[PDB]
Amino acid sequence: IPAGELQIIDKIDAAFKVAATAAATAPADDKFTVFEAAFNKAIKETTGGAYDTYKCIPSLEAAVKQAYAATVAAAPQVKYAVFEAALTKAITAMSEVQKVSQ
Amino acid sequence: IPAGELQIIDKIDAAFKVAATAAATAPADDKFTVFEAAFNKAIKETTGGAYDTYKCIPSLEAAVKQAYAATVAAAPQVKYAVFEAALTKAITAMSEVQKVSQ
Ligand SMILES: [Mg+2]
Numbered sequence: 001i002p003a004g005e006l007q008i009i010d011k012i013d014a015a016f017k018v019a020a021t022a023a024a025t026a027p028a029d030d031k032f033t034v035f036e037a038a039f040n041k042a043i044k045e046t047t048g049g050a051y052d053t054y055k056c057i058p059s060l061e062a063a064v065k066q067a068y069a070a071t072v073a074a075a076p077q078v079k080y081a082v083f084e085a086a087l088t089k090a091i092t093a094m095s096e097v098q099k100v101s102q
Numbered sequence: 103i104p105a106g107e108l109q110i111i112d113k114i115d116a117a118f119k120v121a122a123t124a125a126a127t128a129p130a131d132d133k134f135t136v137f138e139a140a141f142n143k144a145i146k147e148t149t150g151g152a153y154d155t156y157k158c159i160p161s162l163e164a165a166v167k168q169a170y171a172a173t174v175a176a177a178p179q180v181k182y183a184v185f186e187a188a189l190t191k192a193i194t195a196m197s198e199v200q201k202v203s204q
């Protein structure tokens with residue numbers, strides 16, 4: 001994890017939970033869109049405007065891409081479920097590293 | 103797949119989609135309960151009362167147990183997501199066999 005990103009890992013994890021919660025009650029077809037919108041807003045708010053989107057935090061964008069790649073083979077009905085499970089582990093791994101690094 | 107269960111595979115798949123849809127909008131903490139309740143009702147209705155619960159259809163109960171076992175190592179936030187992804191593949195496999203068997 002790039003030293004420059006360490007300071008915001010805790011915020012990423014918090015924002016992620018917020019976004020996951022937001023998409024939890026959204027209809028199946030709206031989960032990805034709601035998740036992203038919620039994730040971006042939580043990140044923007046929690047980082048004080050340092051980032052406007054998760055796509056702009058290097059390590060996170062990398063994890064999101066990998067989480068999406070995990071959905072390619074998954075059936076439509078569960079692509080989001082597969083995505084969330086994958087991303088949850090990735091972010092939790094970042095959080096663990098951040099906690100022992102600082 | 104036991105010959106006796108073949109006749110209801112299509113109904114299991116349909117009922118599953120109904121239950122997944124039902125739990126899709128339920129709050130995270132209510133997904134498992136809502137899924138099960140919806141699944142049981144859809145099965146009872148679709149099989150004309152032949153079964154009152156998914157736990158009573160041998161092959162399905164087996165798949166549900168395995169799907170749950172897949173959640174043990176998953177974090178709480180995603181246990182249902184992991185469960186649904188696992189069960190979706192299991193049921194789809196049954197459906198594929200049923201379609202070529204009849
Ligand atoms: Mg929640």
Ligand SMILES: [Mg+2]
Pocket residue numbers: 027028029122123124126
């Ligand atoms: Mg649905």
